[PDB]
Amino acid sequence: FLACKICLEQLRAPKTLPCLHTYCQDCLAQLADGGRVRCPECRETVPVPPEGVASFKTNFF
């Protein structure tokens, strides 16, 4: 069903963006360059001061 679309494996410590797609936490952190981050599926988004922030989607299971 769903997996981080950077790593393409089941999510670890999922973090959902404000557009809203969910990915692994480091996958966000490593992907972030110049601070900013973009959803790979559509387009750009805001960066948060440290990473490891933004809503942790419902965890299963």
Add this chain to the structure above:
Amino acid sequence: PSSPADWAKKLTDAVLRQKAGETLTAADRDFSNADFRNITFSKILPPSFMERDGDIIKGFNFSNSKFTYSDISHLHFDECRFTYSTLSDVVCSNTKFSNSDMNEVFLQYSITTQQQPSFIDTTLKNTLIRHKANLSGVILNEPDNSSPPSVSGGGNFIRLGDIWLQMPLLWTENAVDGFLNHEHNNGKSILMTIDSLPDKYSQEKVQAMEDLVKSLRGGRLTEACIRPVESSLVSVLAHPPYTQSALISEWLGPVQERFLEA
């Protein structure tokens, strides 16, 4: 049949007549443009068809069908056509595909799938499969100038023979883990999947592996990232036919050294 329930019952009746029950007419065997979304097959069908050396689903045509979020694990298909179908997000844990056609298919199944799918005497031409599969027995043919199926997310594509394989967007911890670490993930990896092929397609394996490494060079990689998969990389790459590959060799060299310091 306008909905999966109807298609399920139609098969469930048709499969039962293949108890058998021999033999079945061609026209009744065709399931062109079927629809099996969200269907769990075991609930509708016997454990014979769904375990060990039991029952076989033979001679069917599931062309242009739609297995999506369906569960198809532990079944065995023989002499079947799955051409043009979408098996995206299916659950096919230890599903067997014999003497079948699965060309131009979407096979990036859901992670929920436990045991690698197994394909024997089966074609995966221009079929995008998930990097965790058992391709020992697969038939390969010359790659056309086709294009990878349009997908959302993920990275670039490489060719395994005429099969499509999608790299991750960035080589991160879980990316590296799921793709390379078959030790933690008990025999499952893109390494095992490329090497899974029969020795006949030696050259195809190497180009696939070479292309796989070519994507691994590009990513700004660090020891720390590869540390948990040093053993995994070596277990497959440090042996033929990947030792006769200069590209793989010169890349594997330093990684092989640190591993041996233990």
